[PDB]
């Protein structure tokens, strides 16, 4: 559950900001949810909840469901929003987000 790391109200604030399709911005999202300023081990705890099938990577299918990892009231990301997350975070160009790529995205937000 994300409340092991993040405040319940910050999660709801961030879900509200992105309730409508096409609005996602990863930098604003990590600022609103309070993931900035957390330790490397807390960020990797969040990474592990988002990696639903426990493959060690957030594949595109799971990137689409990133907001639902924080709240069941969230919506799915559309394909333009999912591609923008790979454009910004997929450093080694293998088409998915690894743990240190995810930690980097949080660091640069």
The answer to whether 91 is a known ligand-binding residue is no
Does 53 participate in binding Ca ion (rule CB under 5 A)?
yes
Residue of 1, 24, 29, 20 whose CA lies nearest to 105:
29
Does 16 participate in binding Ca ion (rule CB under 5 A)?
no
Rounded to a whole number of angstroms, the minimum distance from the CB of residue 49 to Ca ion is: 11
* Closer by beta carbon to Ca ion, 81 or else 90: 90
Beta bridge partners of residue 57, listed in sequence order:
98
Does 55 participate in binding Ca ion (rule CB under 5 A)?
yes
Does 81 participate in binding Ca ion (rule CB under 5 A)?
no
From candidates 78, 94, 107, 108, binder to Ca ion by CB under 5 A: 94
Tell me how far apart the alpha carbons of residues 105 and 109 are, in angstroms, rounded to a whole number: 6
**50 and 58 Cβ atoms separated by less than 8 Å:** yes
């Amino acid at each position: 559950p994300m409340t092991k790391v993040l405040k319940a109200d910050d999660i709801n604030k961030a879900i509200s900001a992105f309730k409508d399709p096409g609005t996602f911005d990863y930098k604003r999202f990590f600022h609103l949810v309070g993931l900035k300023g957390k330790t490397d081990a807390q960020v990797k705890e969040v990474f592990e909840i988002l990696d639903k099938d426990q493959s060690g990577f957030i594949e595109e299918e799971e990137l689409k469901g990133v907001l639902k990892g924080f709240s069941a009231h969230g919506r799915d990301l559309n394909d333009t929003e999912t591609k923008a997350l790979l454009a910004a975070g997929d450093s080694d160009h293998d088409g998915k987000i690894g743990a240190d790529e995810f930690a980097k995205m949080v660091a640069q937000a």
